[PDB]
């Protein structure tokens, strides 16, 4: 704490708030988010596996990762489950998770959750040493510092929070559009903000509705700060027999409580502050919003609506203030900063992933050799172990003698060698000198394995492995090929989770 | 109405183990987590989180409160949780947050959960049917009596005070010896409640009633006395022990306030002087007042004396039953008898199955070469299983070992020894197939023949218990004696 | 605590629970109830005065009477406001006070309350020294120990609670019926339980519905304990063109959550545990319950309904267990015990009321004399005070001399004498000797009062007072006349607040 | 966005009085209740209940938490609430429940609310428009500086540390003397923050920056040192003072834990030895370790040293403004100037209206007989009012008294003295009509002529203030001086 802080105007307490309340730019999560999702991933609470009780996830989170009584654990679960909150839900919830009308979710003992399909994308390759881990509160568990997200989550799901008086307001966005942005950027590090907006014309809210005016959006994407207006989608309908005018509301601005908005209209009508309204009914159901606003016959529909736009939350403004943590500091960022931070994240992730796969590949190949060689010497080895008196003896005995690489010899004829393996081990001039750990591998293998279908199974795996090691080494060899792997991952994501824009921009 | 049964389940101690459901729920978690009395302390939040997720998914601070009370020497006569950190105190101040305190089981809690893994108690489903929970603990401790229970705070009837472990063990032995022993009989081992907080129980007829009917009222009295300062002649009342469940801070205030109101007179100063070491309430008598007089007023106007309504209502064969002292003892001895019985059946099954596997291993070993050659010949592991089972194997040097009470009862006669020909099971084929090369060193014959010889001796011993009600009672005696010895301690409460 | 408890099996803690969780038999309140209502009465939160914010009542309660953070304060307010909870609401609430569907009331800052009209009846004559007061937690305020209720509240509003394992379940009742019971009892102390049931045939729930079978009700009224079955009001309707069968539910048993009941039906239908149901809709609104249960065309309406009665809370039983605190102990009481306890309460109340009115009457009459006499001696008195140098002097001077009872003499020609007033004070043989406090009354009177319209105003009040004292003395004089005052008060209550029975008994 | 302004209002101190809204809300209630520093303590629940009902109807424990923090000597540099009972302590343990603690205003809180009833500050409506609340307090204390403020915990920017009252008063006087005084100028009166918890601020450039720009960072350092036991030679680190807002219990644990991890070495024992009397953390140095070395490690790995980010953001003319030390002083002096001005106008109106009534009384008195006879003649009190107003009254012996700056300004000229004829108002008729007989004793002339003579002297004095900017500044000086004298105290924090 003390050492590392000696050059901000920021003191320790100040930096805790920053770290807890502002999202990381690369995955758009704050620790509490990261901790819930991670706890879910550890439980195997997968999108395509049975729902677990929210309480079960709450207790894990609280026990291993977030030992405070704060409702934030459960509230975060609920929020990530609501389709009026996240443009791309990260939790798939079953039961009462509240509504657009502001009513509460059932208690954690009554709801069930699992990870949304897309959430796995956000935590893809978490086991491949792709991100740093930090200690939990008691030194007993590891927690991701950031998620290896294939999803440009901060943009797509947007953000809120405030620390040291510095607020963050990022609106949600359309995943397809954002992925296109990303690919555009990959092909042109110099692409202008204007060039990006060809792909990302503007925010895209889960609650649809309309944005009036692009000046707000441009300056937001250019500077990180800008105001934009969200307007309800509501026409006036006319009855062809009667001539009755009825305003219908299909969509409202993001973050507006539908019930509270209706209360407000009812109340303006009481106070004669808004005239011309015979009747007010919420006819919304499971299949879409429908607020019914019947116009008096002596009043004008167009006029009553316009009146409502100005006096209520049928129209609100939303101030974009794009702040995230970047390399540890809270910066204001423009649209291109945010995309670059993401693409750069993907490059780090993919590289570390590739390195890991390679080490895992080589370690397994190495082990395979020890066994292949063993299968090929069944009789000397078994007679060896059998006449040794102790496993420990069998081990130091195994290692004593190099071994005639038998029929196995062919299979070897050297990029499958562990970076850590010293030069006197391996296949030194016709013989095979064994790692002391490789002896274990042999001593550890079960009678079961001395079968016919062992040799097929192993030569096969080694074959597959070298093949893999080949392709991994070409990724590390070629920056082009590694950017290829990123484009394809992005493309794949566009295609499995991309959806139709919802908010219309005028 | 149903509301009733639920209110009742929540608050009522099971007579056998002394626990309410939330209690059993916390302690089981700690057990599952391996949070043992002799391993590193764990932060309370981890136990709380586990209990909330798997067993107790309600908002109520109940879970952490239970952990805390199990840790307070003023709460439980035999603490069930060993905790470091601030766990509040007698002045009714709060424990620290669960993220700061840390805990593990007390040695004695393991006695409460002894043999829990030997199928000795029934498990029920947890709230979402993904977990099991014991219905009662296989306790060696007569926990209800020794630790007590109360449901008064929540509107229920149960009010059982704590008791001295040695006294009660002895009680049980007296009972195991003379199942016809009277209440009076029992009362020579257990003259009365023993409170964690010492002090004095004043009078015996309440106790007698309570132990005879399950119902009676008793008086607890603070240990205090008058002191004269040798240099000045000033009198001071010093309070050393107060009645169970009285809040010191409160009591002091009741006095301060009684004094301010002229309701009690003769007091010139009021101070708490208690350490980590001793309670010490200092009440200075006025020079013109008399010590004894002030003190006797205090007894009768503050909680320096208090009544305790005994009402021994617990859960018995699924029901709230009012029970007397003999009933409660008997319910525990009966539980021990059952637990031990179940324990035994399980060790005997466990041992047999293992012996049966060990047999198959030895044989594979005395037929190493044939076997290896057989398995090598095969294409699928499948093939090698049916093959290893197709023929018998001559009981090599292995004959020595085996030659018949180590047959698991489920084994059908076409399997095992038949003519100096070992008839193999398919499961046993697996064990063989599953054998790691390392097990072919000369140190297998050894570890193996030694395990099997151990098995036979236990099996022998287990059959001896099942074959004698007496031997089984003797086991329960020994257990009870061992508890007395390892965990018994001094009476703390003086009965007049 | 210690002294007073030495003969129950009940210890101190035990007796606190009893005192807090079981209702007093005479007013049917527990302390928390009594404390909220009282706090409201003190605030003047009257039925016919503006709503105050619940929070305002909560803070009073919490500050003066009930200093615990428990939701019970606010929850009690809410419950006394809900028409599905109390047969006779004691709070008139405005805003979201929850519903039959179990959803929560808005926070205390959002709702408003005042006393219901009937609640004043419950606290009638609280200022007339009609009930004992106890100290609040800090010795700063007085709180009623019991309310001087004109309403037989325990019966009418019923009860719940549990202490030392002893539960209380009293159902609500119809006020008219209960008042008739009471009058029946007043006219015949020997009236049998059967005789009472002529008036009180059985419970009457705020949620209406039906009771099957009187054996339950009789034994409950005879012994205090008995079970009764409540059944929904639901017919099968048939469409005259189609022949479609549709079960409709208008009323459900008391204490059943409508939403949770519907969930249950939906769920039995899922599990094929109940067959024959095409559709399930709650069509309830502000104007009545309507659960729609459409029957499959190949199924029988009668059969589907009967099935639902047995598998759901469309039919429940309710175990009457009539326990209340009587003279401090928690007793099981029968129907006649409960009525007698009430009527006896009214007798105490009315007597103490009468005594009080009498003392207040006499004290005021006494004071009137001092002034009447003073008005009649304006000139000697004013010349007296004027030549005295100090108010204190004026006082001891006033008292020195008896005073020629002037024109005032007539007005006196003696049941208007304070019980506490010593024989040497008053109108001793032609002169008027003054109380030292009466001198104050004179010294205290304002120039304003020496007007013409003072003599009219005062002789008038005295006239009224003697008249009052007359009627009060006849009440204390005649046990018959005092029972009359009770009948009339009861009758009056029947007539202002009596309503139609709601539950039907079969 | 609006969410912003609200988050901001909730957390941001008004520069003039140093309070957040919830603060002003609690303190105003205590004031309304008359819960004064020299009256009986009141139970916290009564203040909490009042505040919740009239001013702060949210669930948040905020209300009781505020009361508590105002009572903690480790929290506020000048406590605003005097409380008895457990109000928690430096180890971050909790206060007792509001029903057990009791409180009243500290002497100094009255200075914060001085003249609150003299229309000296603006009131706004409370949440339901049935009550009024001051918008700011008419404080004589430069509270923001002296007591500090922080909104960091809730995501806001404000972080102002506390200061020494004497230092700041002096600062204000230096300012009142030379309105052009520099920051350097000011810093000779206020060299730095003064923490309730003493300890050491290590280095001056942070302070300088903070006071010049509103922004800068400072280091707080625990006061501790190495001791050698004369008999053994053993070294012990003794910790006496720790940085502001550090939790002792926490810090001790951080050390215990740092030790268990081999992260810091040289420690052989760790004990808290703090009384009611002194903080005393005992850290025993190993015989093979060096005191200084262990100690310097500790400084740099625990909260024995801590940074404090100063960020002087407060509310000024309705806005969050970053302000430097001169700005904050000036905003307070300006407030004093306004408050005093308003105070004066009000006393002058109050005094005049009262004088005007007193006049009418005197006259009624010198025309007692005529008047009495007039009122007696009447039928309705109404009649007697129009009658008493119909004619003038000769200014009897009363002439002496009156014979012209005691006319309330609102009085129109057809009323009062006109020719040796007193022209009565209708309001004045009421006062007369309202006179109690007891007021006709010879002790009326007295109490009356004395009050009026007092009125004139104050009126005289009040006009003297309005007529001289200088005199008014001198008043503000005197006030400030008086505060310095009654409430000033020693610097506690050492600055290096
Ligand atoms: Mg953490
Ligand atoms: Mg439940
Ligand atoms: Mg359960
Ligand atoms: Mg209590
Ligand atoms: Mg109370
Ligand atoms: Mg709000
Ligand atoms: Mg407000
Ligand atoms: Mg913290």
Short mmCIF file of N, CA and C in Angstrom, two decimals, chain C residues 341-457:
data_model
loop_
_atom_site.label_atom_id
_atom_site.label_comp_id
_atom_site.label_asym_id
_atom_site.label_seq_id
_atom_site.Cartn_x
_atom_site.Cartn_y
_atom_site.Cartn_z
N UNK C 341 -65.38 -10.59 30.56
CA UNK C 341 -64.21 -9.76 30.73
C UNK C 341 -64.39 -8.35 30.07
N UNK C 342 -65.08 -8.32 28.94
CA UNK C 342 -65.26 -7.07 28.21
C UNK C 342 -66.26 -6.20 28.94
N UNK C 343 -67.41 -6.80 29.27
CA UNK C 343 -68.47 -6.02 29.87
C UNK C 343 -67.97 -5.53 31.21
N UNK C 344 -67.27 -6.38 31.95
CA UNK C 344 -66.71 -5.94 33.20
C UNK C 344 -65.75 -4.77 32.98
N UNK C 345 -64.93 -4.86 31.92
CA UNK C 345 -64.03 -3.75 31.57
C UNK C 345 -64.81 -2.46 31.39
N UNK C 346 -65.88 -2.50 30.60
CA UNK C 346 -66.71 -1.34 30.39
C UNK C 346 -67.26 -0.78 31.72
N UNK C 347 -67.72 -1.63 32.63
CA UNK C 347 -68.13 -1.17 33.96
C UNK C 347 -67.02 -0.44 34.74
N UNK C 348 -65.83 -1.01 34.77
CA UNK C 348 -64.76 -0.29 35.39
C UNK C 348 -64.53 1.04 34.70
N UNK C 349 -64.45 0.99 33.38
CA UNK C 349 -64.11 2.19 32.66
C UNK C 349 -65.09 3.34 32.98
N UNK C 350 -66.39 3.00 32.88
CA UNK C 350 -67.49 3.95 33.02
C UNK C 350 -67.52 4.54 34.45
N UNK C 351 -67.28 3.70 35.46
CA UNK C 351 -67.24 4.14 36.81
C UNK C 351 -66.11 5.12 37.03
N UNK C 352 -64.88 4.68 36.73
CA UNK C 352 -63.74 5.58 36.83
C UNK C 352 -64.03 6.85 36.02
N UNK C 353 -64.67 6.72 34.85
CA UNK C 353 -64.95 7.92 34.01
C UNK C 353 -65.83 8.92 34.75
N UNK C 354 -66.85 8.36 35.40
CA UNK C 354 -67.85 9.10 36.08
C UNK C 354 -67.19 9.82 37.26
N UNK C 355 -66.44 9.07 38.09
CA UNK C 355 -65.68 9.68 39.20
C UNK C 355 -64.86 10.88 38.75
N UNK C 356 -64.11 10.69 37.67
CA UNK C 356 -63.26 11.72 37.12
C UNK C 356 -64.04 12.99 36.71
N UNK C 357 -65.12 12.78 35.95
CA UNK C 357 -65.92 13.86 35.42
C UNK C 357 -66.40 14.69 36.60
N UNK C 358 -66.78 13.98 37.68
CA UNK C 358 -67.27 14.56 38.92
C UNK C 358 -66.26 15.42 39.67
N UNK C 359 -65.08 14.87 39.91
CA UNK C 359 -63.97 15.69 40.38
C UNK C 359 -63.64 16.87 39.46
N UNK C 360 -63.80 16.73 38.16
CA UNK C 360 -63.36 17.80 37.28
C UNK C 360 -64.43 18.88 37.31
N UNK C 361 -65.65 18.41 37.46
CA UNK C 361 -66.79 19.25 37.54
C UNK C 361 -66.70 20.09 38.81
N UNK C 362 -66.40 19.43 39.93
CA UNK C 362 -66.40 20.12 41.20
C UNK C 362 -65.26 21.12 41.27
N UNK C 363 -64.09 20.75 40.76
CA UNK C 363 -62.95 21.66 40.78
C UNK C 363 -63.23 22.89 39.98
N UNK C 364 -63.93 22.73 38.87
CA UNK C 364 -64.23 23.87 38.02
C UNK C 364 -65.31 24.75 38.67
N UNK C 365 -66.34 24.11 39.23
CA UNK C 365 -67.37 24.84 39.96
C UNK C 365 -66.73 25.72 41.06
N UNK C 366 -65.91 25.09 41.90
CA UNK C 366 -65.17 25.76 42.95
C UNK C 366 -64.48 27.02 42.45
N UNK C 367 -63.76 26.88 41.34
CA UNK C 367 -63.01 27.99 40.77
C UNK C 367 -63.96 29.07 40.32
N UNK C 368 -65.07 28.64 39.74
CA UNK C 368 -66.08 29.56 39.26
C UNK C 368 -66.55 30.49 40.38
N UNK C 369 -66.86 29.92 41.53
CA UNK C 369 -67.25 30.69 42.70
C UNK C 369 -66.28 31.84 42.99
N UNK C 370 -64.99 31.51 43.17
CA UNK C 370 -63.93 32.51 43.43
C UNK C 370 -64.02 33.71 42.48
N UNK C 371 -64.26 33.43 41.21
CA UNK C 371 -64.33 34.49 40.20
C UNK C 371 -65.67 35.25 40.33
N UNK C 372 -66.77 34.50 40.53
CA UNK C 372 -68.12 35.08 40.59
C UNK C 372 -68.19 36.13 41.70
N UNK C 373 -67.66 35.71 42.84
CA UNK C 373 -67.44 36.51 44.01
C UNK C 373 -66.53 37.67 43.64
N UNK C 374 -65.42 37.39 42.97
CA UNK C 374 -64.56 38.50 42.51
C UNK C 374 -65.30 39.50 41.58
N UNK C 375 -66.02 39.01 40.56
CA UNK C 375 -66.70 39.92 39.64
C UNK C 375 -67.61 40.80 40.51
N UNK C 376 -68.32 40.16 41.44
CA UNK C 376 -69.20 40.87 42.34
C UNK C 376 -68.46 41.85 43.28
N UNK C 377 -67.17 41.71 43.52
CA UNK C 377 -66.47 42.76 44.29
C UNK C 377 -65.40 43.53 43.51
N UNK C 378 -65.63 43.79 42.21
CA UNK C 378 -64.60 44.41 41.34
C UNK C 378 -63.81 45.48 42.09
N UNK C 379 -64.53 46.42 42.70
CA UNK C 379 -63.94 47.64 43.29
C UNK C 379 -63.09 47.49 44.54
N UNK C 380 -63.60 46.76 45.57
CA UNK C 380 -62.73 46.45 46.73
C UNK C 380 -61.49 45.65 46.30
N UNK C 381 -61.70 44.61 45.49
CA UNK C 381 -60.60 43.77 45.01
C UNK C 381 -59.54 44.54 44.23
N UNK C 382 -59.97 45.29 43.20
CA UNK C 382 -59.02 46.06 42.39
C UNK C 382 -58.29 47.08 43.27
N UNK C 383 -59.05 47.83 44.10
CA UNK C 383 -58.42 48.76 45.06
C UNK C 383 -57.47 47.99 46.00
N UNK C 384 -57.84 46.76 46.35
CA UNK C 384 -56.97 45.92 47.17
C UNK C 384 -55.64 45.60 46.49
N UNK C 385 -55.71 44.98 45.30
CA UNK C 385 -54.53 44.56 44.53
C UNK C 385 -53.65 45.76 44.21
N UNK C 386 -54.32 46.84 43.82
CA UNK C 386 -53.67 48.05 43.39
C UNK C 386 -52.82 48.64 44.51
N UNK C 387 -53.27 48.49 45.77
CA UNK C 387 -52.57 49.07 46.93
C UNK C 387 -51.61 48.05 47.57
N UNK C 388 -51.83 46.76 47.34
CA UNK C 388 -50.82 45.72 47.62
C UNK C 388 -49.61 46.02 46.74
N UNK C 389 -48.39 45.68 47.19
CA UNK C 389 -47.19 46.03 46.42
C UNK C 389 -46.63 44.90 45.48
N UNK C 390 -46.99 43.65 45.78
CA UNK C 390 -46.46 42.44 45.18
C UNK C 390 -47.63 41.49 44.95
N UNK C 391 -47.64 40.74 43.83
CA UNK C 391 -48.63 39.65 43.64
C UNK C 391 -48.78 38.73 44.86
N UNK C 392 -47.64 38.32 45.42
CA UNK C 392 -47.59 37.52 46.65
C UNK C 392 -48.38 38.20 47.80
N UNK C 393 -48.20 39.52 47.93
CA UNK C 393 -48.95 40.30 48.89
C UNK C 393 -50.40 40.29 48.55
N UNK C 394 -50.74 40.65 47.32
CA UNK C 394 -52.13 40.59 46.86
C UNK C 394 -52.81 39.25 47.22
N UNK C 395 -52.05 38.16 47.13
CA UNK C 395 -52.57 36.81 47.40
C UNK C 395 -52.93 36.68 48.91
N UNK C 396 -51.93 36.83 49.79
CA UNK C 396 -52.19 36.72 51.24
C UNK C 396 -53.20 37.78 51.75
N UNK C 397 -53.35 38.89 51.02
CA UNK C 397 -54.33 39.91 51.32
C UNK C 397 -55.72 39.46 50.93
N UNK C 398 -55.84 38.90 49.75
CA UNK C 398 -57.12 38.39 49.28
C UNK C 398 -57.74 37.40 50.25
N UNK C 399 -56.89 36.50 50.74
CA UNK C 399 -57.26 35.38 51.61
C UNK C 399 -57.60 35.79 53.06
N UNK C 400 -56.91 36.82 53.55
CA UNK C 400 -57.21 37.41 54.84
C UNK C 400 -58.74 37.57 55.10
N UNK C 401 -59.44 38.24 54.19
CA UNK C 401 -60.83 38.66 54.48
C UNK C 401 -61.91 37.85 53.79
N UNK C 402 -62.86 37.27 54.54
CA UNK C 402 -63.99 36.74 53.77
C UNK C 402 -64.70 37.85 52.95
N UNK C 403 -65.52 37.49 51.97
CA UNK C 403 -66.09 38.49 51.04
C UNK C 403 -67.59 38.44 50.96
N UNK C 404 -68.22 39.61 51.07
CA UNK C 404 -69.69 39.70 50.94
C UNK C 404 -70.04 39.01 49.62
N UNK C 405 -70.59 37.79 49.68
CA UNK C 405 -71.23 37.15 48.52
C UNK C 405 -72.37 38.06 48.05
N UNK C 406 -72.14 38.84 46.99
CA UNK C 406 -73.06 39.93 46.56
C UNK C 406 -74.29 39.41 45.84
N UNK C 407 -74.50 39.85 44.60
CA UNK C 407 -75.57 39.28 43.76
C UNK C 407 -75.29 37.77 43.53
N UNK C 408 -74.02 37.40 43.67
CA UNK C 408 -73.60 36.02 43.51
C UNK C 408 -74.31 35.09 44.50
N UNK C 409 -74.65 35.64 45.68
CA UNK C 409 -75.31 34.85 46.74
C UNK C 409 -76.45 33.93 46.23
N UNK C 410 -77.36 34.51 45.45
CA UNK C 410 -78.49 33.77 44.87
C UNK C 410 -78.07 32.46 44.18
N UNK C 411 -77.07 32.56 43.31
CA UNK C 411 -76.57 31.48 42.45
C UNK C 411 -76.23 30.15 43.15
N UNK C 412 -75.69 30.25 44.37
CA UNK C 412 -75.35 29.11 45.28
C UNK C 412 -76.57 28.34 45.93
N UNK C 413 -77.51 29.07 46.55
CA UNK C 413 -78.72 28.47 47.15
C UNK C 413 -79.58 27.74 46.09
N UNK C 414 -75.54 21.07 48.61
CA UNK C 414 -74.25 21.62 48.16
C UNK C 414 -73.19 20.56 47.62
N UNK C 415 -73.66 19.80 46.62
CA UNK C 415 -72.94 18.71 46.03
C UNK C 415 -71.85 19.18 45.04
N UNK C 416 -71.52 20.48 45.06
CA UNK C 416 -70.54 21.05 44.11
C UNK C 416 -69.23 21.33 44.79
N UNK C 417 -69.12 20.79 46.00
CA UNK C 417 -67.95 21.00 46.87
C UNK C 417 -66.97 19.88 46.57
N UNK C 418 -65.72 20.23 46.27
CA UNK C 418 -64.66 19.24 46.09
C UNK C 418 -64.52 18.33 47.29
N UNK C 419 -64.46 17.03 47.04
CA UNK C 419 -64.21 16.04 48.10
C UNK C 419 -62.97 16.47 48.94
N UNK C 420 -61.96 17.06 48.33
CA UNK C 420 -60.75 17.43 49.05
C UNK C 420 -60.81 18.74 49.83
N UNK C 421 -61.91 19.48 49.78
CA UNK C 421 -61.91 20.86 50.28
C UNK C 421 -62.26 20.91 51.76
N UNK C 422 -61.38 21.47 52.58
CA UNK C 422 -61.61 21.50 54.04
C UNK C 422 -62.72 22.45 54.54
N UNK C 423 -63.37 22.09 55.68
CA UNK C 423 -64.67 22.68 56.06
C UNK C 423 -64.65 24.17 56.34
N UNK C 424 -63.48 24.72 56.67
CA UNK C 424 -63.34 26.16 56.93
C UNK C 424 -63.23 27.01 55.67
N UNK C 425 -63.19 26.36 54.50
CA UNK C 425 -63.19 27.06 53.20
C UNK C 425 -64.55 26.94 52.55
N UNK C 426 -64.90 27.93 51.73
CA UNK C 426 -66.21 27.94 51.09
C UNK C 426 -67.07 29.02 51.70
N UNK C 427 -68.40 28.80 51.68
CA UNK C 427 -69.37 29.81 52.09
C UNK C 427 -69.82 29.60 53.54
N UNK C 428 -68.88 29.73 54.50
CA UNK C 428 -69.16 29.64 55.96
C UNK C 428 -70.00 30.85 56.45
N UNK C 429 -71.21 30.53 56.95
CA UNK C 429 -72.24 31.46 57.51
C UNK C 429 -72.29 32.92 56.96
N UNK C 430 -72.61 33.06 55.67
CA UNK C 430 -72.80 34.38 55.01
C UNK C 430 -71.58 34.99 54.32
N UNK C 431 -70.40 34.51 54.64
CA UNK C 431 -69.21 35.07 54.06
C UNK C 431 -68.55 34.00 53.15
N UNK C 432 -67.60 34.42 52.30
CA UNK C 432 -66.84 33.48 51.46
C UNK C 432 -65.34 33.50 51.77
N UNK C 433 -64.89 32.44 52.44
CA UNK C 433 -63.48 32.23 52.71
C UNK C 433 -62.83 31.48 51.51
N UNK C 434 -61.73 32.06 51.01
CA UNK C 434 -61.07 31.65 49.75
C UNK C 434 -59.93 30.66 49.91
N UNK C 435 -59.88 29.64 49.03
CA UNK C 435 -58.69 28.81 48.85
C UNK C 435 -57.57 29.76 48.42
N UNK C 436 -56.34 29.46 48.86
CA UNK C 436 -55.16 30.20 48.44
C UNK C 436 -54.92 30.05 46.90
N UNK C 437 -55.31 28.90 46.36
CA UNK C 437 -55.26 28.66 44.94
C UNK C 437 -56.34 29.50 44.23
N UNK C 438 -57.53 29.63 44.84
CA UNK C 438 -58.61 30.48 44.29
C UNK C 438 -58.21 31.95 44.16
N UNK C 439 -57.30 32.38 45.03
CA UNK C 439 -56.82 33.74 44.96
C UNK C 439 -56.08 33.92 43.64
N UNK C 440 -55.20 32.94 43.35
CA UNK C 440 -54.52 32.82 42.06
C UNK C 440 -55.50 33.01 40.94
N UNK C 441 -56.57 32.22 40.95
CA UNK C 441 -57.58 32.29 39.89
C UNK C 441 -58.00 33.73 39.60
N UNK C 442 -58.02 34.55 40.64
CA UNK C 442 -58.47 35.90 40.55
C UNK C 442 -57.35 36.75 40.03
N UNK C 443 -56.24 36.72 40.73
CA UNK C 443 -55.05 37.38 40.26
C UNK C 443 -54.69 37.03 38.83
N UNK C 444 -55.09 35.83 38.40
CA UNK C 444 -54.75 35.31 37.05
C UNK C 444 -55.68 35.76 35.94
N UNK C 445 -56.86 36.25 36.33
CA UNK C 445 -57.86 36.58 35.32
C UNK C 445 -57.55 37.91 34.62
N UNK C 446 -57.91 37.94 33.35
CA UNK C 446 -57.52 39.05 32.50
C UNK C 446 -58.63 40.13 32.45
N UNK C 447 -58.19 41.39 32.34
CA UNK C 447 -59.08 42.55 32.26
C UNK C 447 -60.26 42.27 31.36
N UNK C 448 -59.96 41.71 30.20
CA UNK C 448 -60.92 41.12 29.27
C UNK C 448 -62.20 40.56 29.90
N UNK C 449 -62.04 39.90 31.04
CA UNK C 449 -63.15 39.15 31.61
C UNK C 449 -64.16 40.07 32.36
N UNK C 450 -63.74 41.26 32.82
CA UNK C 450 -64.63 42.24 33.51
C UNK C 450 -65.73 42.85 32.63
N UNK C 451 -66.02 42.18 31.53
CA UNK C 451 -66.96 42.67 30.57
C UNK C 451 -68.42 42.35 31.03
N UNK C 452 -69.39 42.76 30.21
CA UNK C 452 -70.79 42.38 30.40
C UNK C 452 -70.96 40.89 30.18
N UNK C 453 -70.57 40.42 29.00
CA UNK C 453 -70.72 39.02 28.63
C UNK C 453 -69.85 38.03 29.45
N UNK C 454 -69.45 38.42 30.67
CA UNK C 454 -68.72 37.55 31.60
C UNK C 454 -69.71 36.91 32.55
N UNK C 455 -70.54 37.75 33.17
CA UNK C 455 -71.60 37.31 34.09
C UNK C 455 -72.58 36.34 33.45
N UNK C 456 -73.10 36.68 32.27
CA UNK C 456 -73.86 35.71 31.48
C UNK C 456 -73.01 34.40 31.35
N UNK C 457 -71.78 34.50 30.82
CA UNK C 457 -70.93 33.32 30.53
C UNK C 457 -70.65 32.41 31.75
#
